[PDB]
């Protein structure tokens, strides 16, 4: 939606390496604000965004309590799945779960999320109606029964529709100037000769937020999609993203190529070219 909050849980059974580990990270759109790792020296909830640090000690103790309990709950979960699939205590296994809520224009819940995966594959997931589940296989059916009896769906619906949206709004308010302001990318084209007949024109987009962006190379107007080498959007390390698009073109003719950049932080799409200097 307009904004979203997500929690990514990773619980891992590591035979020999140690007791079941549990990691949890919190995100508001493309910004991480919290982190918990039941393996660090002091297992506690730590801040990862400046704006979240304004929350008092009560908030932290609250998150830490939940996460510590989650650590134990997930250990059971891992064992249960092990049995479900008739697995041994010899192999490593990982459970992943994503919780989240999308804020609509009206400030209310637009869409809720809750999906789990065992060893990289879908296991169980809450449906769009926030009242029914979808088991991937018969083993997941067991979990579904437990969860239906325990009324987990209703519990989650309450959270997604209420608590999630409520706190998402608080977070958005606290970090207004960073979370609600879209940063446009700094663009520039570079020329890299590969041979006396061809050269690579690389169009850069750095320091933009959020990650969503579209880079395109055009020759006299026609989109050179079929020949554009595009890298996956990558984090700059300072809460911003960077990405580039390159195209191999013949010497001289390069003056016929233009880069088209699209990002929400721009009033209209940019169109730049390589300026020989």
């Amino acid at each position: 939606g307009s904004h979203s909050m997500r929690y990514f849980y990773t619980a891992m059974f590591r035979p020999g390496r140690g007791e079941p580990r549990f990691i949890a990270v919190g995100y508001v759109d493309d910004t991480q604000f919290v982190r918990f790792d039941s393996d660090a020296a002091s297992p506690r909830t730590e801040p990862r965004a400046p704006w979240i640090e304004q929350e008092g000690p009560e908030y932290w103790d609250r998150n830490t309590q939940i996460f510590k309990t989650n650590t134990q709950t997930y250990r059971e979960s891992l064992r249960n799945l092990r049995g479900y699939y008739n697995q041994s205590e010899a192999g490593s296994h990982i459970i992943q779960r994503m919780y989240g809520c999308d804020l609509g224009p009206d400030g209310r819940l637009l869409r809720g999320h809750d999906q789990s995966a065992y060893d990289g594959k879908d296991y169980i997931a809450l449906n769009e109606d926030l009242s029914s589940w979808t088991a991937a296989d018969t083993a997941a059916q067991i979990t579904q029964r437990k969860w239906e009896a325990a009324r987990v769906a209703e519990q989650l619906r309450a959270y997604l529709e209420g608590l999630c949206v409520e706190w998402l709004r608080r977070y958005l308010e606290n970090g207004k100037e960073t979370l609600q302001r879209a940063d446009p990318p700094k663009t520039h084209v570079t020329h890299h000769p590969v041979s006396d007949h061809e050269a690579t024109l690389r169009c850069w987009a750095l320091g933009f937020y959020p990650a969503e962006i579209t880079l395109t190379w055009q020759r006299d107007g026609e989109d050179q999609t079929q020949d554009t080498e595009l890298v996956e959007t990558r984090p700059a390390g300072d809460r911003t993203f960077q990405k580039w698009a390159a195209v191999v073109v013949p010497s001289g003719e390069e003056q016929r190529y233009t880069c088209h950049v699209q990002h929400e932080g721009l009033p209209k799409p940019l169109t730049l070219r390589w300026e020989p200097s």
């Binding site: 949890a24 998150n63 709950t73 979960s77 437990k146 969860w147 999630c164």
Partner: peptide
């Protein structure tokens, strides 16, 4: 703020 995983898998 996260929910509470009361019920295991």
């Amino acid at each position: 703020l996260p929910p509470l995983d009361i019920t295991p898998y």
